[PDB]
Amino acid sequence: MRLKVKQSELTAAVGWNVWNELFTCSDDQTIHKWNMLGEPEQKVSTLDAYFTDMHWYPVSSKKTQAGGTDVFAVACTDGSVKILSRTGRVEKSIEGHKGACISLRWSYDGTALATAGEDGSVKIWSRNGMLRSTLAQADSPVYSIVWAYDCDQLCYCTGSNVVIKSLSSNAKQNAWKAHDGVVLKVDWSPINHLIITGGEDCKYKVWDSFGRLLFQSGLFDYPVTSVAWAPSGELFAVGGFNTLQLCDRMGWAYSKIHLNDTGSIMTLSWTADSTQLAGGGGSGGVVFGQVVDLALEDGKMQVTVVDDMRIVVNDILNENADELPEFRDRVIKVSLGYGYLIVATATQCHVYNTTNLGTPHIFDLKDTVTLLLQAERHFLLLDNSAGIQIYTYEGRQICNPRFQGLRTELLNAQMITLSNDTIAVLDQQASGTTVRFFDTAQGRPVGEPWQHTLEVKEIALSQAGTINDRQLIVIDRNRDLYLLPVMKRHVAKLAAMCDSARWHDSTAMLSAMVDQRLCVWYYPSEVYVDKDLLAKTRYTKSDSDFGKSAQIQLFAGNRCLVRRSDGVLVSAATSPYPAVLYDMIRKQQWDKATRLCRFIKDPTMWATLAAMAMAAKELNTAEVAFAAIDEVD
Numbered sequence: 001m002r003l004k005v006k007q008s009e010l011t012a013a014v015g016w017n018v019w020n021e022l023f024t025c026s027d028d029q030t031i032h033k034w035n036m037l038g039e040p041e042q043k044v045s046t047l048d049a050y051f052t053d054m055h056w057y058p059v060s061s062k063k064t065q066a067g068g069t070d071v072f073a074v075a076c077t078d079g080s081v082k083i084l085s086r087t088g089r090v091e092k093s094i095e096g097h098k099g100a101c102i103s104l105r106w107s108y109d110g111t112a113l114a115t116a117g118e119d120g121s122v123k124i125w126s127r128n129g130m131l132r133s134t135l136a137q138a139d140s141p142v143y144s145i146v147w148a149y150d151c152d153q154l155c156y157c158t159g160s161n162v163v164i165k166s167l168s169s170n171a172k173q174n175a176w177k178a179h180d181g182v183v184l185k186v187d188w189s190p191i192n193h194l195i196i197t198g199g200e201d202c203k204y205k206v207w208d209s210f211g212r213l214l215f216q217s218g219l220f221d222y223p224v225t226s227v228a229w230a231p232s233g234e235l236f237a238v239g240g241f242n243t244l245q246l247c248d249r250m251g252w253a254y255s256k257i258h259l260n261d262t263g264s265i266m267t268l269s270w271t272a273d274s275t276q277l278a279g280g281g282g283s284g285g286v287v288f289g290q291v292v293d294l295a296l297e298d299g300k301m302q303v304t305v306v307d308d309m310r311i312v313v314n315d316i317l318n319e320n321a322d323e324l325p326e327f328r329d330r331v332i333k334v335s336l337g338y339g340y341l342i343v344a345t346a347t348q349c350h351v352y353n354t355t356n357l358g359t360p361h362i363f364d365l366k367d368t369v370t371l372l373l374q375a376e377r378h379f380l381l382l383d384n385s386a387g388i389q390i391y392t393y394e395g396r397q398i399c400n401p402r403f404q405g406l407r408t409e410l411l412n413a414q415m416i417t418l419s420n421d422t423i424a425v426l427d428q429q430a431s432g433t434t435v436r437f438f439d440t441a442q443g444r445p446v447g448e449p450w451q452h453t454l455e456v457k458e459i460a461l462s463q464a465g466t467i468n469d470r471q472l473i474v475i476d477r478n479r480d481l482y483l484l485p486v487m488k489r490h491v492a493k494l495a496a497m498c499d500s501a502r503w504h505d506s507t508a509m510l511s512a513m514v515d516q517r518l519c520v521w522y523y524p525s526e527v528y529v530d531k532d533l534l535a536k537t538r539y540t541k542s543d544s545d546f547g548k549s550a551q552i553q554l555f556a557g558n559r560c561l562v563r564r565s566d567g568v569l570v571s572a573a574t575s576p577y578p579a580v581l582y583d584m585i586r587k588q589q590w591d592k593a594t595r596l597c598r599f600i601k602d603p604t605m606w607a608t609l610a611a612m613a614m615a616a617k618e619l620n621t622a623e624v625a626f627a628a629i630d631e632v633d
């Protein structure tokens, strides 16, 4: 994918509302409205004041919108902070700072407004403009502030440093030196908890919430002047001197675009649906970017989302391409798998059998789709109104799993996982981190919710077999990898120093990054049975280093595709044999499996077969396998 860019003294601030209007604040002392086509529509207001920053009152869903929430706040150079309506009516003007107010953000729950001054103060206000508290007084201008999602913590920069402070508690403000120079912008994703920064050392960087560096860019020619997370948390944008870059959440860049005489891009804002962004530059021009050329593939099928109207389906059964009919509303979310293509527009969900593109099943959407997941039998669609929805591939809603205190706007693909019989959801709260399971038939809770002692980074369900086969992996914040069956549910630790893990597409096998090495478990369940045989069915490629923070993108057939932190996709061969053993054994062909193992004389396959045999209680076979293993010793 890439950023498709369109360009419209200084344009000081930009911000999209949930109605997909872009408001821009310029040094002409005017505020203008723009539409998603990147066209100017109206002068909304004119003020005797210069602008530095703006923020729309945050709305989780325009469907659950009702209230006086159609307002935005603007920071001014005279130190005032003004709340304006969508129509430009001044609701409230606040004398917030001495000298310019240079950054501000509404809390996510809308109960507070945070402002920061060149005077180095960070202040917290009620909407009534009352001073709620002075959070901080730094020794340098606080160029950028953002909230934690719970609104009990604020992240801000001062000098070279990033600071995280609690509003309620005191404890210890976490702080670190982020850049070798002045930090110019920060952002903190509420959905993936990652922090991004850019500054005068001419780099951008990605951090976790604890100050651990996850990515640092090479040198730009000039300071990085803005960074912004897409609401999806899967992408962020970077602005600089006549440049705009689109980055993966891992940090590496999809595209770097040179802009036409914009000066530095000082301000960034994304649309709520993460498909577009806007940037304000020192020149005063407004830049519009659209995320395009999304590529999906599954087996022989390749799908390219050309733009928000146009999709091509490439069916390489004979080097083919089919252009889908142009979409009547903007394409928002697309997913491919299991022989089906799902296209969610702003108002409709299309489900295509990829072999019969001419007859999709289509149903109405009443809210913005925020996630699509697919399994063999059905798929999952998420929005912030009805929440978690499980659909047949003919478009019939099967169930709507829910639980008290579920916050759907915080779920990404790391937090919720689907399979043929089970859904698992990470329920993250100040009180506790627990994994909750639900069945896909009725959406009813399955078993007792599982509590971990540490914060969890991500969870994922295995795909093969039945409910008794269903397993969850858990990676926690210490980078420990756990295995947890849905039904027997007794946890086991599989690895330390785990950066990633992925279930095999078609079998119970598991892959993971373990201290930067590729490790494969041919039979992960063995950990509950026999630690010694578990080790014999676990293979680590000792000499292949995937670097820091590598992410497994696919584990299927006999290959594992691994995305490195630097954006390089590595293809690693795994054993050609264990999937064949799985196939043979589900067909009860124990004779054939023993013959195969006798032919390849591979101790790890003998161990895998022995594990399979013991679980099936094929004792004759297990005996042969153990005999073969003990023989090579």
Ligand SMILES: O=C([O-])C(=O)[O-]
Pocket: 567, 568, 569
């Ligand atoms: O996505 C890819 O294959 C790449 O990195 O070129």
